[PDB]
Amino acid sequence: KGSFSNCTVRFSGQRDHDAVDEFINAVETYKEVEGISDKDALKGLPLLFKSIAVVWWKGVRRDAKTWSDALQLLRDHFSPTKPSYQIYMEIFETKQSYDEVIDSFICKQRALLAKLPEGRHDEETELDFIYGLMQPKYRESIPRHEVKTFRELLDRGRTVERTR
Amino acid sequence: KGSFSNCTVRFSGQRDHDAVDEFINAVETYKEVEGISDKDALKGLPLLFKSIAVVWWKGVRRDAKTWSDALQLLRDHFSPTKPSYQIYMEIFETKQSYDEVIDSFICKQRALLAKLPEGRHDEETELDFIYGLMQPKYRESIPRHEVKTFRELLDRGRTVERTR
Amino acid sequence: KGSFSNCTVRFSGQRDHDAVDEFINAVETYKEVEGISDKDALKGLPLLFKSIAVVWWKGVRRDAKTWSDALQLLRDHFSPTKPSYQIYMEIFETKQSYDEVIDSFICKQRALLAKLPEGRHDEETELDFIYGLMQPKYRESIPRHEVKTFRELLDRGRTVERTR
Amino acid sequence: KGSFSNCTVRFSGQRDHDAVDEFINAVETYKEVEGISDKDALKGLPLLFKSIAVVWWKGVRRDAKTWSDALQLLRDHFSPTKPSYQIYMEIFETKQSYDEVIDSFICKQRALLAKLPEGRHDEETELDFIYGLMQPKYRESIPRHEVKTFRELLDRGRTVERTR
Amino acid sequence: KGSFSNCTVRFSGQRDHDAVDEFINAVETYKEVEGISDKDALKGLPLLFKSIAVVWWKGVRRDAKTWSDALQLLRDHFSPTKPSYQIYMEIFETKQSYDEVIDSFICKQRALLAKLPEGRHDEETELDFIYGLMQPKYRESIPRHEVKTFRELLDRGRTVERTR
Secondary structure (H helix, E strand, C coil), X not given: XXXXXXXXXXXXXXXXXXXXXXXXXXXXXXXXXXXXXHHHHCCCHHHCECCHHHHHHXXXXXXXXXXXXXHHHHHHHHCCCCCHHHXXXXXCCCCCCCCCCHHHHHHHHHHHHCCCCCCCCCCHHHHHHHCXXXXXXXXXXXXXXXXXXXXXXXXXHHHHHHHC | CCCCCCCCCCECCCCCHHHHHHHHHHHHHHHHHXXXXXXXXXXXXXXXXXXXXHHHHCXXXXXXXXXXXXXXXXXXHHCCCCCHHHHHHHHCCXXXXXXXXXXXXXXXXXXXXXXXXXXXXXXXXXXXXXXXXXXXXXXXXXXXXXXXXXXHHHHHXXXXXXXX | CCCCCCCCCCECCCCCHHHHHHHHHHHHHHHHHHCCCHHHHCCCHHHCXXXXXXXXXXXXXXXXXXXXXXXXXXXXXXXXXXXXXHHHHHHCCCCCXXXXXXXXXXXXXHHXXXXXXXXXXXXXXXXXXXXXXXXXXXXXXXXXXXXXXXCHHHHHHHHHHHHC | CCCCCCCCCCECCCCCHHHHHHHHHHHHHHHHHHCCCHHHHCCCHHHCECCHHHHHHCCCHHHCCCHHHHHHHHXXXXXXXXXXXXXXHXXXXXXXXXXXXXXXXXXXXXXXXXXXXXXXXXXXXXXXXXXXXXXXXXXXXXXXXXXXXXXXXXXXXXHHHHHC | CCCCCCCCCCECCCCCHHHHHHHHHHHHHHHHHHCCCHHHHCCCHHHCECCHHHHHHCCCHHHCCCHHHHHHHHXXXXXXXXXXXXXXXXXXXXXXXXXXXXXXXXXXXXXXXXXXXXXXXXXXXXXXXXXXXCCHHXXXXXXXXXXXXXXXXXXXXXXXXXXX
């Protein structure tokens, strides 16, 4: 049923991890849903670029041969894959300011913790790294060693938020 | 005939009841009209998120297994389901100001009264809760005990509005 | 061939006669062109609302049963169907200002004269009601009793406009 | 394959020759490409108007019977078909200012010369009417009687432009 | 499956090399992917122009007979194909300013070097022409004669960028 005719999601070259990962996941998901072969998918790839990136594709066209190589090359030229110590310094710089919802803080911190190499941290030390930066509006009620998984922190945060 | 190819309605994370309920009802209605199966509908769900929420979906992907569970989880993480006393204080705070149409006031107050638990109020006390906040431009003509249902209030409000 | 999948024309609740009549005529025309049945058309109606009006449709869903009833209810809740004397006062308030084209004035005045009940006025008194408000730039050349229909007024107005 | 479902090009009523001619040519071209019959094309015409013009179509609906009559009526009510002496005064009013490209000047002047009645001018006097208003940056090099057609003027203008 | 029905990419007449080359490559790629014949593709070409360029197409319609001739004519009337010495003066005018990423500089300089006639320069002198304008933030670490191809320059530039 077609092969990359037209869609809303495009890519520009904004040089950030979130936009690049969102675009790659959306394209990779669309290919699986619509059911397009691997050889037919690479011919339609300049139908998505609209910016500086199409000038980037006019030069590096002869380096790609398969779909996985082109996707890894798009991940390599733009996502700079920052090292570990900048991430560990970026988590401890900004505390949770007053009058901010729990869910935005938790999803931003989880998206920041996903950048580390996989298999290096469990769930328990993951929650222990995040339990040291919350406001005293939430730390007065729920103590440590009672919340065992990463869902129960939000489950008890939404109760104190409604109570005020 | 396809399975969530592309559409105008998307979701961002605006943290409000009206936008979330509108998006969920529009998606739930589109699934019923187009005739898509339940197993095929969950594979196409990241084609709708475009914001902070796609970073939220990159983390909580392994918690969803059926369509109803994913819809209830999207209702739970964003719509905060406010308690009763804040609603009963929010209805009595703002009176109807001068030079405002009847229909906007009635639809906003009905959308505010839908947040209570279902089966707790009849139609008569529902109209009795709304008849105490209207302007004297409308309360001089129509008295109580004459309007029995919730349609006749608008039916007699549109007559006095045309008369001026 | 589908049933209200996606389209550009939507409705918000702007509270005016022109936008409501345009939206209703466009939807009614699209249903006739595409060839959709009456029972299939009502299931897809919340795919068009995008505003306050979808909160209005979450409350008055159980009042509609057929397509004509829903269309008349949408005409009733928003188009206020103003009385006659306000129209007859609105026609005689604004004269035709200098340096304005004939066609805009004629189409606006015809759209204002359509609001009266049908069958109350002929063509001759219709032109007699409009011939008293034009500029002396056009009334110096063409006199009364020479223009018999409503097309010849524009036909002789476009000649004097080109001449200047 | 459908009959005027939805498209980007619409019409508003901007009262100019270029926008009206572009819209009419695009619609006339789309009808020929998609292959739609003449009786099916007139039912879908209010799906394109979005402005004051739809109020204009609610009044003059009963005057159209064929496609050519409706197209000529749309050309008549909006394009005012200016007389000859205003065109001959409009060509000689604005000279070519300094630092402006040749191609924009030539295409604008050709679009202005198309408004005259057809068959009144050859190619030679057409170029003779345009050779009297160019800058001395171009008239120092190429003389008259050497450029015979209307293409060689641009062909020798692009050479002097690159040279500077 | 259709023949140029509607798409996002259009052309205006912006008079620059990048936008024209992007539009031509996107159209040429779409024709190859969708599988449209050469005779059917030329009838649908005024469905893409939306600007001054459609007035340009109303005049030069009778000069095109095949697809390749129309594409070369669109490349000729707008892309001015600048001479060599302006390019060789444009490369050496702007050095790499401080705090700018390597990839943007490399892709812009490659897109500028593509304008020369093909077959005039190898890869080695191509890298030698670009190695004289970089910042001392990168020239302190990597010396000449160690980087042999044009990929290893970026491969060693991304390492020093992460290190800081």
